[PDB]
Design a protein around this ligand. Structure first.
Ligand code: MG
Lengths: 310, 313
């Protein structure tokens, strides 16, 4: 008779995957995550058009030396931060804000973008303890995160598709990793033209998180495993007990409205090694690249919306 | 006088045979030949070579009695790859391409070491390095290794080329030759659009890829040889007549040898940083998939050959 959402919170850190901060307080998650697709959606849906207009004015005012393209890049960061700030008002934990996906193969520019996000939060009175910087888990992203963590900036290594890939993150001292459960299962279904989801025991996305969790706990890695990007509530339920799960508002609502018993299920690499191991994983090779391309398309669309409102 | 399409092609393009079978090579008279781990495995399994592994083990053990099992297997594998290259060189005037172990494809330093070991093994047999192309997968690390090998006068064949940015980086590194995999690019195109039949030549992504690389090279003054490889049918080869070079399977060479129509000549005459290369490759879903797949398939066959070796130790 307790809801599945309530029971899941007793064994796992529940995180809301959304930039629509007005939806968050219903669910009382500990943390929240945004990404370029979610920010774009929040901006396109217009509930927050005042916040957007006010952000553009402020950045223009404070940056009279920037030409058009530089001004737009700066507003795009300020927007990501303004949504994070509003999220932080309605949660007790941290918000994840993602670096521009276009710098995913450049460690130096990733480091600089990450520090810029942190500085903008600091300028707005938010200390870095409340923020995770999301970075795609290419080799360069991991190398950037290694340095950011040394400087006390916690990172959320996203677009995780392979276990070796997660192990390299942990080896770099990363705060948290996010395996993309639903996209791993999308590949599995696409491979065989499957129209129905696989049994949970045979669901590659669920199994991937299970394997990463078992590796971390047995080796004593402190990096948090946070399953992400789910296709349905059964995939979330399958991972009850995981350190953290970040869940869309639609699935959080399904978990809130479901009253059954929740069974609790869950209780060094060189660059050359990493690239070899990624190469051995056809799904991971494809999905990491695809993830960067899709987040890139959404970041470009957001820039266009900013350009239209200058 | 009138000549077959194969003999006409030799006049405008360097014709190269893509096989480890030296007897077949002999009858098409290509200038160069290319081998790879998949073709070497197929040859090794053929009845003619049933004692080749045991002989090579014998000879290799004898010359290195102090090596551990891993070290030995490795030496036998190079010896086998080189043995097929030598037999091919006995029957052609040009060069043979011999591929480094695909497992070192993300390690420039171990690629360089393997490439020099191949060159040394040929040299031990009296074959100078000007008759050999070392085949390296065109990952960024493969291009870095090739850049350094070329500096030492070791010519490389940069294989598994799927994108014009790889090809441009290879040229910028001064590599001797690049091999775009025409058939495999068309394979992706057909799977992407549920195509039941081959696209028109004008619309064939694999053919167009080589056309684009050839155009880019000539316009930039790059001397790197463009060599189209891995064809699906003879029409794709004919579509590239005039290309610097084309490496063609014996089945397709036989088709060209037997055609007699006129062959119309179709091709006539910023810098890429590592981050730029990785971004451009990332934008190309086909290239990202196909380069990784090519390394995996060559690796699977290299391991299969190692396993044949191990069961004979
Ligand atoms: Mg000679």
């Amino acid at each position: 008779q307790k809801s599945v959402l309530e029971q899941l919170k007793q064994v796992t850190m529940v995180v809301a995957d959304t930039g629509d901060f007005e939806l968050i307080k219903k669910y009382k998650p500990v943390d929240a995550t945004t990404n370029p697709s979610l920010i774009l959606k929040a901006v396109k849906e217009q509930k927050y058009s005042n916040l957007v207009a006010e952000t553009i004015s402020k950045v223009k005012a404070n940056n009279p030396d920037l030409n058009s393209d530089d001004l737009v890049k700066e507003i795009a960061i300020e927007i990501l931060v303004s949504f994070g700030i509003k999220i932080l008002d309605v949660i007790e934990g941290k918000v994840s804000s993602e670096v521009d996906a276009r710098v995913s193969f450049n460690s130096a520019t990733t480091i600089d973008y990450a520090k810029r996000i942190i500085a903008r939060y600091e300028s707005n009175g938010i200390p870095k303890d409340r923020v995770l910087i999301k970075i795609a888990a290419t080799w360069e992203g991991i190398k950037a995160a290694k340095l950011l963590q040394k400087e006390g900036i916690n990172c959320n290594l996203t677009l995780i598709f392979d276990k070796a890939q997660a192990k390299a993150c942990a080896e770099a001292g990363v705060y948290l990793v996010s395996p993309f459960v639903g996209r791993i299962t999308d590949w599995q279904m696409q491979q065989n033209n499957l129209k129905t989801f696989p049994a949970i025991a045979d669901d590659d996305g669920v199994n991937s998180v299970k394997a990463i969790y078992k590796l971390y706990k047995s080796h004593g890695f402190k990096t948090i495993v946070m399953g992400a990007s789910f296709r349905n509530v059964e995939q979330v339920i399958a991972l009850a007990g995981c350190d953290a799960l970040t869940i869309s508002p639609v699935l959080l609502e399904e978990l809130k409205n479901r009253d059954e018993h929740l069974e609790v299920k869950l209780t060094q690499i060189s660059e050359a090694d990493f690239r070899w191991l990624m190469n051995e994983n056809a799904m991971a090779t494809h999905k990491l690249a695809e993830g960067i391309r899709l987040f890139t398309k959404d970041t470009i669309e957001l820039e266009n919306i900013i350009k239209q409102n200058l």
